[PDB]
């Protein structure tokens, strides 16, 4: 089922 | 043990997509137009149920810092530096993002046909290229959604509305001269 897209914020990173 | 994929088939859509393909994705806000993106890479959980797609975002003109401007096409999109990762089931369907020229060429423009003339910096809002060719008395860039006519006198192109004129009248002419001719 079409999931909804969640976008990030411009110029951010994933700490992991 | 994730491995990059060649292509993926999206069932609810029931279409298959490849890295480099342009896709629309269902936005968080359902009252808003579909996100436009380019598929960089497709990755899988080994052999597993889940699939995730990594995309490079196309920004819609009203989706950017500057906001939509009068010379921005209805189907215009910006190629940006913004990448992030979304699951595959977002993909609402596919689209073509055309070069400016080839958009102009299209006989007819599909609901799914876009075009791109700018690169976009999601962080700063700065454009590449910085500046572009302008036309008419407005000295605005070309908006492909707008009808324009040529004064061979000046060779400049004019929006009829900006030059005393109705659209239907402009379409009539084979013989145009602006007021500076
Ligand atoms: Zn002229
Ligand atoms: Zn004009």
Author numbering:
A (entry chain P): 21 to 36
B (entry chain A): 7 to 187
What did the study's authors say about this model?
In Arabidopsis, the BAH and PHD dual domain-containing proteins SHORT LIFE (SHL) and EARLY BOLTING IN SHORT DAYS (EBS) function in chromatin-mediated floral repression and seed dormancy. Here, our biochemical and X-ray structural studies show that SHL is capable of recognizing an active histone mark H3K4me3 and a repressive mark H3K27me3 independently via its PHD and BAH domain, respectively. In this study, we identified SHL as a dual histone methyl-lysine reader that is distinct from other reader proteins in recognizing both H3K4me3 and H3K27me3, two well-known histone marks with opposing roles in balancing chromatin and transcriptional states. In contrast, the SHL from Populus trichocarpa (PtSHL), which has similar PHD and BAH domains and shows similar H3K4me3 and H3K27me3-binding affinities, successfully yielded crystals.
We further determined the structure of the PtSHL-H3(20–36)K27me3 complex at 3.2 Å resolution. The peptide adopts a right angle-like conformation with a sharp turn at H3A31 and is bound within a negatively charged surface cleft on the BAH domain. In detail, the interaction features the recognition of the H3K27me3 trimethyllysine by a classical aromatic cage formed by Tyr41, Trp63, and Tyr65, similar to other canonical methyl-lysine readers. Interestingly, the side chain hydroxyl group of H3S28 is anchored and fixed between PtSHL His88 and Asp90 and forms two hydrogen bonds with them. The interaction between H3S28 and PtSHL His88 fixes the side chain rotamer of His88, locking the conformation of the imidazole ring of His88 in a parallel alignment with the prolyl ring of H3P30 with the alignment stabilized by hydrophobic and CH–π interactions. Although H3K9 and H3K27 share the ARKS consensus motif, H3P30 at the n + 3 position of H3K27me3 (but not H3G12 at the n + 3 position of H3K9me3) can be specifically recognized by PtSHL, suggesting a sequence-specific recognition mechanism. Mutations of His88 (H88A) or Asp90 (D90A) involved in H3P30 recognition as well as mutations of the aromatic residues responsible for H3K27me3 recognition (Y41A, W63A, Y65A), abolished the binding of PtSHL with H3K27me3. In addition, Arg32, Asp90, Gln92, and Asp95 form several hydrogen bonds with the main chain of the bound H3K27me3 peptide. The superposition of the two complexes yields an RMSD of 0.94 Å, suggesting a nearly identical overall structures. Moreover, the binding between 2-fold excess H3(1–15)K4me3 pre-saturated PtSHL and H3(20–36)K27me3 yielded a binding affinity of 18.7 μM, similar to the 21.3 μM binding between PtSHL and H3K27me3, suggesting that the recognition of H3K4me3 by the PHD finger and the recognition of H3K27me3 by the BAH domain are independent of each other.
